[PDB]
Design a protein around this nucleic acid. Structure first.
Length: 142
DNA sequence: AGGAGGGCGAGGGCGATGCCACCTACGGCAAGCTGACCCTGAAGTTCATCTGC
């Protein structure tokens, strides 16, 4: 684990596309309606981190909490099919499954993952957290 | 077009729902009368009546 509380500003651009143009309440890039400032959802940037790590790390201890063929209950059950098959005493079983999701998956280590879904792998609060990235000036949507 | 529209799990926990006394006081529950008339008796004789003379 780390020992310093890094806090950062990420300034990223978008030139000729949707930064996070999937506000399915519509489709125009996610804007702040009262300012017109764009709102790249922090989950969009987290999915970008997921995709980068998937392209690059592509290893155990750096798994991604993956795309479409990533039905989450299946991945979470893969935590309950290991050292904590059943011998972890549900209160500790969830903790151990959560620990395995951390160690194995780079995303649950970096960000979190609501995993209390199938054989509940607990909640990870995501040491690294991004916030809704908003544009400094209001974005015009071409 | 084709999207996906929640997944999860919690929705009480705790104790208390009574404490206190009282649930009667007072007095009267009668008054006044009546509770029966009437007869019907034994024993004997009289007296009116009947039968027989």
């Amino acid at each position: 684990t780390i020992e310093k509380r890094y806090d950062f500003v990420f300034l990223f651009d978008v030139q000729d596309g949707n930064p996070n143009g999937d506000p399915d309440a519509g489709n125009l890039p996610r804007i702040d309606p009262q300012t017109g400032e764009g709102l790249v959802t922090d989950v969009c940037l987290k999915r970008k981190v997921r995709n980068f790590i998937q392209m690059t790390q592509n290893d155990e201890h750096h798994d991604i909490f993956i795309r479409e063929k990533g039905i989450l209950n299946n991945l979470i059950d893969e935590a309950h099919e290991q050292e904590n098959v059943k011998g972890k005493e549900k209160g500790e079983k969830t903790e151990a499954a959560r620990q395995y999701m951390c160690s194995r998956y780079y995303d649950i280590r970096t960000f979190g993952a609501v995993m209390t879904t199938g054989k509940n792998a607990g909640q990870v609060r995501g040491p690294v957290q991004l916030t809704f990235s908003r544009s400094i000036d209001p974005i015009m949507t071409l």
